[PDB]
Amino acid sequence: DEEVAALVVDNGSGMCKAGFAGDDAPRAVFPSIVGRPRKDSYVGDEAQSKRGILTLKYPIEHGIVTNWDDMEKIWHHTFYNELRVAPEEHPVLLTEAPLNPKANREKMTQIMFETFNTPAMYVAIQAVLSLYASGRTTGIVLDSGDGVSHTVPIYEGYALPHAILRLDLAGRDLTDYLMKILTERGYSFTTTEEREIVRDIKEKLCYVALDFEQEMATAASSSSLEKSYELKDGQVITIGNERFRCPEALFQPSFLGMEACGIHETTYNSIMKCDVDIRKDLYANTVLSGGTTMYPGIADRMQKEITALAPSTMKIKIIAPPERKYSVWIGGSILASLSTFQQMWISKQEYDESGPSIVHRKCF
Numbered sequence: 455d456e457e458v459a460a461l462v463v464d465n466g467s468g469m470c471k472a473g474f475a476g477d478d479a480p481r482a483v484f485p486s487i488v489g490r491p492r493k494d495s496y497v498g499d500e501a502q503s504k505r506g507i508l509t510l511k512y513p514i515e516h517g518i519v520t521n522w523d524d525m526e527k528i529w530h531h532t533f534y535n536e537l538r539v540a541p542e543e544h545p546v547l548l549t550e551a552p553l554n555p556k557a558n559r560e561k562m563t564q565i566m567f568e569t570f571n572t573p574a575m576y577v578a579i580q581a582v583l584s585l586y587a588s589g590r591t592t593g594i595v596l597d598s599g600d601g602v603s604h605t606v607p608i609y610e611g612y613a614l615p616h617a618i619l620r621l622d623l624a625g626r627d628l629t630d631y632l633m634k635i636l637t638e639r640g641y642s643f644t645t646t647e648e649r650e651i652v653r654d655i656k657e658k659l660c661y662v663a664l665d666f667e668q669e670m671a672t673a674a675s676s677s678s679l680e681k682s683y684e685l686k687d688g689q690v691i692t693i694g695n696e697r698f699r700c701p702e703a704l705f706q707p708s709f710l711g712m713e714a715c716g717i718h719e720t721t722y723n724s725i726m727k728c729d730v731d732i733r734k735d736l737y738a739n740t741v742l743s744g745g746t747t748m749y750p751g752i753a754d755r756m757q758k759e760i761t762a763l764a765p766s767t768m769k770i771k772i773i774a775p776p777e778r779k780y781s782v783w784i785g786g787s788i789l790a791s792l793s794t795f796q797q798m799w800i801s802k803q804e805y806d807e808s809g810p811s812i813v814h815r816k817c818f
């Protein structure tokens with residue numbers, strides 16, 4: 455093979471996923487955190503490990519880069535520590551959030567070519583990559599991560615900006631809500647250390663009820679839904695209706711004091727903002743992606759809720775790939791490996807010729 459390996463980097467609000475194009479899974483996954491004393495800068499797992507003596511910064515907020523100096527440190531960490539490669543020796547495919555500001559796209563481009571000297575690079579919308587990973591070029595993606603959720607209508611490979619909706623309700627909000635209701639139960643989960651424990655409980659024992667009220671009634675009249683969780687010190691606690699009450703906030707944000715529509719309504723509203731001619735394709739291809747869509751039972755619940763909102767004659771189909779926690783990254787691996795995509799990379803030559811703004815023409 456004459457070609458060097460291409461890198462695929464998916465930066466998220468809570469976790470970054472990095473690897474090599476062609477692989478079926480990322481080689482490294484670490485927290486999107488940079489810390490400095492309360493080496494001078496700590497990044498990823500080590501930063502989390504030593505958070506006690508550091509002041510942490512989160513470069514990506516709600517999917518958007520807001521601290522470029524620390525974002526640069528996360529990328530440096532990715533190349534040299536996690537993947538152990540030299541960026542000037544490999545093309546790099548980066549991911550971005552839906553509706554990412556123009557100026558941000560140009561900044562990412564300039565940094566890759568001028569700071570890391572990448573031989574080539576490209577930036578793709580996260581939701582679009584997840585759609586590709588499911589074998590589709592048309593459909594609507596509900597991407598819910600740790601800091602933000604988006605409903606992104608995509609037609610023939612192109613996202614529709616006017617119909618994209620953003621919901622600032624995701625994994626982090628759900629973790630804190632579980633800490634709250636478990637505390638109301640009689641336990642006490644309030645510290646940063648305890649937040650990590652509860653995040654684990656959430657990922658291991660939570661689920662989406664098909665019928666909220668019936669589930670609440672079953673939990674109130676029996677112990678059939680209770681599950682046990684063992685703490686490090688050995689204490690075993692019980693989780694009951696909290697198991698499904700936590701993710702229920704996705705469908706009813708008022709539980710969190712938010713007036714926003716739930717994920718089902720948001721999905722429906724995005725579809726209605728699209729041209730009537732493509733709505734049926736979207737209803738028949740609603741794909742879930744992101745860690746927060748991993749809850750058991752979420753696909754069937756979405757099927758039920760959307761069916762209730764859409765015309766009775768509409769064919770509804772919810773797709774929930776088993777590997778959807780990393781579908782964004784996998785889609786990127788697939789894209790960067792495609793024969794027809796090789797001509798799409800922005801080369802150092804092209805960057806030198808057109809500058810940062812070339813990203814708007816090359817990465818549409």
Ligand SMILES: Nc1ncnc2c1ncn2[C@@H]1O[C@H](COP(=O)(O)OP(=O)(O)OP(=O)(O)O)[C@@H](O)[C@H]1O
Binds near residue numbers: 598743
């Ligand atoms: N099995 C699971 N069940 C529920 N939540 C889960 C599960 N696995 C992971 N999560 C949650 O998914 C979130 C992280 O997912 P993801 O990596 O998609 O987000 P991100 O890309 O870091 O952030 P964002 O996309 O908001 O910018 C965390 O809140 C985590 O607790």
Ligand SMILES: [Ca+2]
Binds near residue numbers: 465599782
């Ligand atoms: Ca993400």
Ligand SMILES: [Ca+2]
Binds near residue numbers: 713
């Ligand atoms: Ca409400």
